[PDB]
Amino acid sequence: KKEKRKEAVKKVIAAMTVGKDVSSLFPDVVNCMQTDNLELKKLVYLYLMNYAKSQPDMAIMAVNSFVKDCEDPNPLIRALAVRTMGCIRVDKITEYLCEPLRKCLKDEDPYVRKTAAVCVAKLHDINAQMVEDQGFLDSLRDLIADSNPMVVANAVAALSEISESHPNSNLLDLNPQNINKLLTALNECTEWGQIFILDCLSNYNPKDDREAQSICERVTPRLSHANSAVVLSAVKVLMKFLELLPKDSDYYNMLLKKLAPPLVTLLSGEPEVQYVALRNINLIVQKRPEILKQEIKVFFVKYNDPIYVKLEKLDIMIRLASQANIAQVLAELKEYATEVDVDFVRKAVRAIGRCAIKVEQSAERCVSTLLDLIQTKVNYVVQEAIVVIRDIFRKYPNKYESIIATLCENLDSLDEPDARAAMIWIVGEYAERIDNADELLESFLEGFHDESTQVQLTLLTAIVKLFLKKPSETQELVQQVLSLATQDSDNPDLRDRGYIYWRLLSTDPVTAKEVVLSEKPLISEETDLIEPTLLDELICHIGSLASVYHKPPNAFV
Amino acid sequence: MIGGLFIYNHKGEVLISRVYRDDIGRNAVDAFRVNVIHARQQVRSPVTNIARTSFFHVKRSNIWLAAVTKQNVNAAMVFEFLYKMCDVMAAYFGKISEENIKNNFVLIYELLDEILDFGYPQNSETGALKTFITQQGIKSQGWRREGIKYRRNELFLDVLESVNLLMSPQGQVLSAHVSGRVVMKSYLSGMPECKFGMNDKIVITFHQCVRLSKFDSERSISFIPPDGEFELMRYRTTKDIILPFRVIPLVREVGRTKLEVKVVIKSNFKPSLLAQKIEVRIPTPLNTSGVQVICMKGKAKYKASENAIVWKIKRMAGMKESQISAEIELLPTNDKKKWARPPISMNFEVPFAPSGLKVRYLKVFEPKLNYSDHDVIKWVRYIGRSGIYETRC
Amino acid sequence: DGMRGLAVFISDIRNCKSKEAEIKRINKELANIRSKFKGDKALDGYSKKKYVCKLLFIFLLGHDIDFGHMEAVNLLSSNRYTEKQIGYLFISVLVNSNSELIRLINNAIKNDLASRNPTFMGLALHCIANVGSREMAEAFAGEIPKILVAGDTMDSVKQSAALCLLRLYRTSPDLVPMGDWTSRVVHLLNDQHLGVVTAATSLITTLAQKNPEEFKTSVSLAVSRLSRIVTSASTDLQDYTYYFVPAPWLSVKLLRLLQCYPPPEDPAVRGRLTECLETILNKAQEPPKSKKVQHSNAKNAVLFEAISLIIHHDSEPNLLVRACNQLGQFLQHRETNLRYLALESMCTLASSEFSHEAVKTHIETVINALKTERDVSVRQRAVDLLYAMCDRSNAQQIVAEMLSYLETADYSIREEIVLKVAILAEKYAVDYTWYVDTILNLIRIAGDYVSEEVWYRVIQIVINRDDVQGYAAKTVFEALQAPACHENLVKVGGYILGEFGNLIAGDPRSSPLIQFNLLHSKFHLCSVPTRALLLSTYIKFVNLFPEVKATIQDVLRSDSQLKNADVELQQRAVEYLRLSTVASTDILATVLEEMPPFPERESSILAKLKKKK
Amino acid sequence: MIRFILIQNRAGKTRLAKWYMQFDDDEKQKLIEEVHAVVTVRDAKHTNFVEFRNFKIIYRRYAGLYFCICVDVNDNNLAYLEAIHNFVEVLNEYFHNVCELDLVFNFYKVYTVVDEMFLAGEIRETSQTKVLKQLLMLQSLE
């Protein structure tokens, strides 16, 4: 009858997985848990999981069965019972789980100990406020030193999860000679164990240069094949340990020369690992520039990469482009110019301008290739080109002013709001030379509403500039945007800036001329950098999602 | 560290789900479904930050894997774990498909429990996890006398199958069972190996020389056919049954003076072949004295000895219609007759297998004479009989 | 027998191999029918019918067909009814643009309509009305009304002609005059049969919705018909009593027709309508005659149409109270369809001023249904109904419950909810401190899905009110320094702190240094518009808090803002640096002090809510 | 008014497509696909009056078929659901049993039944006995 019971249990589990509610058959499954075959008990426990993880409440009655099963001699069933008892998030789970867990931590089986450590981390998530939680935390630290690597990996993961609470505690771990134990674990652990223990070790601090050098020398060889997880954690812990002075022993130069090749090889895995590794090497390059100094050739995006990998490869390529690599970068961007993909081609043509701003030696070549690329007469290409030339003018003034004419030759359609803002700004700033500036800005003042706020704001600033450059003729148009954006518009930022300009023009026009039309400083090769302190704290979180999102962990949890 | 895990199809239906964190609920499921399954113009990106909850996703064929997280997870660890999980599933039950996941729920749940607990992706080695999993997945991709010689190649292949059914008078089927027996005669010379190709579509005493060790792969059957007529085996298929005929009896007790009965037979097999000897027996209450029957097809008579109306059809094609309407004279009686509610019984024979069993291939190879299998010229005839085929009325 | 070959063809094409084999077979049959049509003596009626039906199945199966269509009109010029039916079905399903083809079809239909058989006229009318065309309307504008007149025509052709005229009026409104047949249709309304009454009611309803002036007489006749139908006899008209409910469809159509008209003028007609509605409600209150669900659906369909009619009239207070009581009773019905219709109808009902208190009575039931509907549409209807009954004495509870729903709702429709909460808080707030708290709760809870123009509204309210400024500033100050705050809160905080930073400076725990420091901490990681807003806030702090002037200058003088790659930020930084540097103290105080209150505009939130839905 | 009538099945094949306004060639296929996707997801414990786009459909399962009528937003909900049930009953009492095979092999008769009880987008005829009588009077004639 055992085979028939097992078949019935499997059918019930399949029916529950289908979606229908089988809570009526719960007592039969609960009674069936008292068997001897491991497969039958395991299949019952999966059925109990199906209810427990999603909505625990109907499986609370099996506490006595769990306690009875926890004394079984086979480690598989014992660990399964411990995990099952811990999996239910109920108030009374602690009372029935604390007593078995203490004996479980000393179980003569590595698998039982690993499941017990995961259960401790699970119990610390819900209802961990008494001294029992502190006692288990103290016992876990002793458990870290163990022969099995699975148990030490899972205990380190449990400690990392527990350390979210910070009641003036030094992460409830670390000690003298304990780092040696952690490295010994790295010697014989698995890939995931290496990831866990290394992410934990990255939260330590070095006391002396010798200890930091020893730790760095011990960690570098562990460049495994777990995709960009173990390697990324290794580079995180290496760069977080960059306490070696530049004027010191020939290890820092050795460290960089040994770190660059493995970091180049991350761009060889699956596209998702490609994306994460690309964002992370973006952050690393922005922080330390002398790593990927002469390895640009790997970032040239081919036809086998998806859209996000393409875009981030262009971003990092712009970051790494210098005067010595202008030829290859511009040739490859000219190749990118005909890649059909709208977002990719916009990014590629904006790369030609960001590189031109970045590298002042080849501005002429960048402008030449920009012109040849505009001659394509494609609407989105020309719009991104006018944005790029707006960016270039702010960097090089009164040198490339003639180009707007040969770009306006192909402006049949203007629909990108960034392009509209660029054209409006270009007309407004150079309003003492463009004779048709008044006509243009009067033409733009028809559909002022139903426009993006940036376009409205740039148009308002351009109109006030045009008034301040040609006060006599157009003092009937500035009052057509200062009474159409300051009264008829609900945009507190826009409205308050409109009053700011209105009061400047009506209080002291000399100060108005000296403020709005002031000689603005140049862009100064701004390559979209990150604030230094944000970069410094993101270097401490290379592996985590903080690097992929480029935001500190406090901004999202 | 991993806050959950979901698997989506092309239409966004959640085939499996396993939630580890307390924070992630059905809101995250709806979030991911709406924000990637129903994407309109957003740029594709594997990790998305929505409602302060991360959403890693890896696309494999027509299956969407989502590893929802609500923490500062090691970003590439989730991708490495997802790839390791895909490799493990490839090792266990091969390529990922709708049927595989729909049929291996227990295997998937056990695999997730073993590889993953509370969000930490523990060891995923195939050899290490092989001993830790007890469930196995399901993948869906005669002695003769010496010197027996026959001058004429005569071979019989009769698919005799019995169909039984009892449907509700409203038209709902309640129970049906089939008892099928295969009888064949083999007038062959030498000792050849004969291959019998057939679509099982069902899992099933067999002959001494019949071995069913490799019957799982299509048919893959090899046997030595003894001379003379014999029974192959007994089988019963219920999942795939093609009812040959349907009867919808519309009776009406219009008072006690007369009784109105209306039975319709609606053939629902292929019109290319014609059923033979269609017999319908309509029971009649015992209070009858004289009745008149009108039939659109064939002829009918009244059998007072059997107290029933006999209806016979010479032959009809598939998807045809036939009307039998009988005016039943009813005696006044006293009370408590109720006609006992007798079922409508029919008997017939059709030239096709009621279960739809069609022979796929028949290859004969003779090691001694070495004649081609195509040289065996034989035509197959089917005799699909009917058992106690009664429809309640 | 008509045709048997079609059956074998269908069985051959159904139980076939992969789609390549099916395509090969269908192309072979197409070539065969090509050969059959091309030449030969294919004048046999059965052969033509078989080939036309086969070709029609070829089209409906999913394959393109563009030939063999002249045979369709060849079939029509025949006396066999079945051939005409197949030809008309072919014409209806497949249509082509060939002037001669349409001309010949119109000639065939015109010859059809001058017959003495209702079957032929019915087929022609179905062919006309099942496709619809300007050419057909122009060629038959004056023929169908010539049939709807009280001539020697059967009932089936009358119904077909009435619905054909409805179709033509729906597709060619300018092609239907109002000559000497409007009174004929009105008199057709009170005719025998019941199907002709249904068709006439549909036509009259559409025409009255278009031109109410023509059919002012129909209201009294509709009222009389409804009064007769609702309570005539237990088992009268045995062919139309749909499960012990007398003609639910005709009653629904008549109630809709009455709905498309103002209240009846004659007091006797008004009394008859009122008593008929009362007896409908009473019958709905009675226990069901049959345990089946179809009797319940018929009774409830008639009842809900009656409720909608009462709402449209909005004239009887007792009837409105009874309707609200009935809907409240249905709010707890076992079925889900009845619950959803009850919620929708009560949402319609809550607008009327005669039963607002009666609607407000069921607030607890509606809230419980919102919480535990277990569906995705019933909850949305509950939200709409809750938005309907909210009033000045009811805003707090409803807004709190909508917030509780928003916290744990699917993110697909997590925007209509926040718009409704914002508009309810703006409209029905007694003390605007509650409005500010509710908007900040929306910002904290939803954040990503709030609006473009909710925080515009909250800044407008804070600036205009001048009585909630202190509490708004304090709430924002103790709401920004939370760890995880959405950037919408950062924008609102920047503006509010810039404009009302002196209302908190009295407290030593909130000196300008700490406000500026937290604003700058939020400044690093935000989009460009947020940084522009925060720069305007900083230049407001320059003159509002002269103590922190040096720190503000040191902020917006560094290379991070004066060299910013975006035009907006660089322009704002350079202007504000120049304004702080000139330090005239007579212009900086003048420019950055007024911020006059917003004029009362059209409340853009309502406009966007209407446009989105 | 009735927008269109569809008789689909669990697989997704359309056994009767009847549109009462002109749709584009690809618009019809998109409408059928999205109607099938919407209808398949829901179950017994759900409303039959599921709405999408600017319309609403009235879906009601029967045997292995999904009868679907799309109506305007202002049109009644229960009346059209019962019209669907009446149409199903007329099919059931005409074919003596409704099934996908009969619809496939008798598409023209299904079309004439639909045009009998649903003409020009409205409910032409209400009663089953009268429709059945008039139809039998239109079947023995040839």
UniProtKB/Swiss-Prot annotation, chain A:
Found in which tissues? Expressed in the brain (at protein level).
Q: Name one GO molecular function term.
A: protein-containing complex binding
Query: For the modification N6-acetyllysine, which residues carry it?
Result: K240
Keywords associated with the record: Acetylation, Cell membrane, Coated pit, Endocytosis, Membrane, Phosphoprotein, Protein transport, Transport
Q: Keyword Heme: yes or no?
A: no
How does this protein sit in the membrane?
A: Peripheral membrane protein
Entry's localization field: Cell membrane; Membrane, Coated pit
What biological process terms from GO does the record include? aorta development; cardiac septum development; clathrin coat assembly; clathrin-dependent endocytosis; coronary vasculature development; heart development; intracellular protein transport; kidney development
Please state the span of the N-terminal signal peptide per the UniProt entry: none
A Gene Ontology cellular-component term: cytoplasmic side of plasma membrane
Q: Tell me the superkingdom of the source.
A: Eukaryota
In UniProt terms, what function does this protein have? Component of the adaptor protein complex 2 (AP-2). Adaptor protein complexes function in protein transport via transport vesicles in different membrane traffic pathways. Adaptor protein complexes are vesicle coat components and appear to be involved in cargo selection and vesicle formation. AP-2 is involved in clathrin-dependent endocytosis in which cargo proteins are incorporated into vesicles surrounded by clathrin (clathrin-coated vesicles, CCVs) which are destined for fusion with the early endosome.
Annotated family: Belongs to the adaptor complexes large subunit family.
This chain belongs to the protein called AP-2 complex subunit beta
Q: Which organism is it from?
A: Mus musculus
The lineage, from the top, is: Eukaryota, Metazoa, Chordata, Craniata, Vertebrata
**Gene transcribed to yield this protein:** Ap2b1
From Swiss-Prot, chain B:
| GO MF assignments | disordered domain specific binding; lipid binding; low-density lipoprotein particle receptor binding; signal sequence binding; transmembrane transporter binding
Name the Pfam families on file: Adap_comp_sub, Clat_adaptor_s
The compartments listed are:
Cell membrane; Membrane, Coated pit
Gene3D superfamilies associated with the record: 3.30.450.60, Mu homology domain, subdomain B
Boundaries of every MHD domain copy: 152-392
Spell out which residues are annotated as carrying Phosphoserine. S45
- Any idea which positions bind a 1,2-diacyl-sn-glycero-3-phospho-(1D-myo-inositol-3,4,5-trisphosphate)? K299, K303, K312
One Gene Ontology term of the biological-process aspect is:
vesicle-mediated transport
SUPFAM superfamilies documented for this protein: Second domain of Mu2 adaptin subunit (ap50) of ap2 adaptor, SNARE-like
Tissue specificity, per the record, is:
Expressed in the brain (at protein level). Detected in spleen.
Effect of gene disruption?
A: Embryonic lethal before day 3.5 postcoitus (E3.5).
InterPro entries, alphabetically? Adaptor_comp_med_subunit, AP2_Mu_C_sf, AP2_Mu_N, AP_mu_sigma_su, Clathrin_mu, Clathrin_mu_CS, Longin-like_dom_sf, MHD
- Coiled-coil stretches: none
Q: Which UniProt keywords apply?
A: Cell membrane, Coated pit, Endocytosis, Lipid-binding, Membrane, Phosphoprotein, Protein transport, Transport
Q: How does it sit in the membrane?
A: Peripheral membrane protein
- Domain of life assignment: Eukaryota
An example GO CC term for this entry is:
AP-2 adaptor complex
Report the sequence similarity comment from the record. Answer: Belongs to the adaptor complexes medium subunit family.
Full protein name: AP-2 complex subunit mu
From Swiss-Prot, chain C:
Membrane topology recorded in Swiss-Prot or TrEMBL: Peripheral membrane protein
**Altering K38Q: what's the impact?**
Reduces phosphatidylinositol binding
Q: What is the effect of changing K49Q?
A: Strongly reduces phosphatidylinositol binding. Abolishes phosphatidylinositol binding
Q: Name one GO molecular function term.
A: disordered domain specific binding
List of residues binding a 1,2-diacyl-sn-glycero-3-phospho-(1D-myo-inositol-3,4,5-trisphosphate): R4, G5, K36, Y46, K50, Y51, V52, C53, K54
The record describes its quaternary structure and partners as: Adaptor protein complex 2 (AP-2) is a heterotetramer composed of two large adaptins (alpha-type subunit AP2A1 or AP2A2 and beta-type subunit AP2B1), a medium adaptin (mu-type subunit AP2M1) and a small adaptin (sigma-type subunit AP2S1). Binds EPN1, EPS15, AMPH, SNAP91 and BIN1. Interacts with clathrin. Interacts with HIP1. Interacts with DGKD. Interacts with DENND1A, DENND1B and DENND1C. Interacts with FCHO1 and DAB2. Interacts with ATAT1; this interaction is required for efficient alpha-tubulin acetylation by ATAT1. Interacts with KIAA1107.
| Any one annotated GO CC term | cytoplasmic side of plasma membrane
Q: What keywords is this UniProt entry annotated with?
A: Cell membrane, Coated pit, Endocytosis, Lipid-binding, Membrane, Protein transport, Transport
> Which portion of the entire protein is included?
8 to 619 of 938
Q: What is the effect of changing K54Q?
A: Reduces phosphatidylinositol binding
What's the protein name? Answer: AP-2 complex subunit alpha-2
Swiss-Prot/TrEMBL GO biological process terms: clathrin-dependent endocytosis; intracellular protein transport; postsynaptic neurotransmitter receptor internalization; regulation of hematopoietic stem cell differentiation; synaptic vesicle endocytosis; vesicle-mediated transport
The entry's localization annotation reads:
Cell membrane; Membrane, Coated pit
Gene name, per UniProt, is Ap2a2
Curated annotation (Swiss-Prot), chain D:
Q: Give the chief site where it resides.
A: membrane
Gene Ontology biological process: clathrin-dependent endocytosis; intracellular protein transport; postsynaptic neurotransmitter receptor internalization; synaptic vesicle endocytosis; vesicle-mediated transport
Designated gene of the protein: Ap2s1
Q: What does this protein do?
A: Component of the adaptor protein complex 2 (AP-2). Adaptor protein complexes function in protein transport via Transport vesicles in different membrane traffic pathways. Adaptor protein complexes are vesicle coat components and appear to be involved in cargo selection and vesicle formation. AP-2 is involved in clathrin-dependent endocytosis in which cargo proteins are incorporated into vesicles surrounded by clathrin (clathrin-coated vesicles, CCVs) which are destined for fusion with the early endosome.
Residues bearing the modification Phosphoserine: S140
Offer a single GO CC term for the protein: AP-2 adaptor complex
Q: What is the effect of changing L65S?
A: Slightly reduces interaction with CD4 endocytosis signal motif
* Result when mutating V98S: Abolishes interaction with CD4 endocytosis signal motif
Keyword Protein transport among UniProt keywords: yes
User: Example GO molecular function term?
Assistant: clathrin adaptor activity
Q: Which domain of life is it from?
A: Eukaryota
Cellular localization per UniProt: Cell membrane; Membrane, Coated pit
Q: Which InterPro entries match?
A: AP_complex_ssu, AP_mu_sigma_su, APS2, Clathrin_sm-chain_CS, Longin-like_dom_sf
> Family assignment?
Belongs to the adaptor complexes small subunit family.
- What effect on the protein does mutating N92W have, as reported in its record? Abolishes interaction with CD4 endocytosis signal motif
Name of the protein this chain belongs to: AP-2 complex subunit sigma
Instruction: Name the UniProt key words of this record, in alphabetical order.
Output: Cell membrane, Coated pit, Endocytosis, Membrane, Phosphoprotein, Protein transport, Transport
Q: Which SUPFAM superfamilies match?
A: SNARE-like (SSF64356)
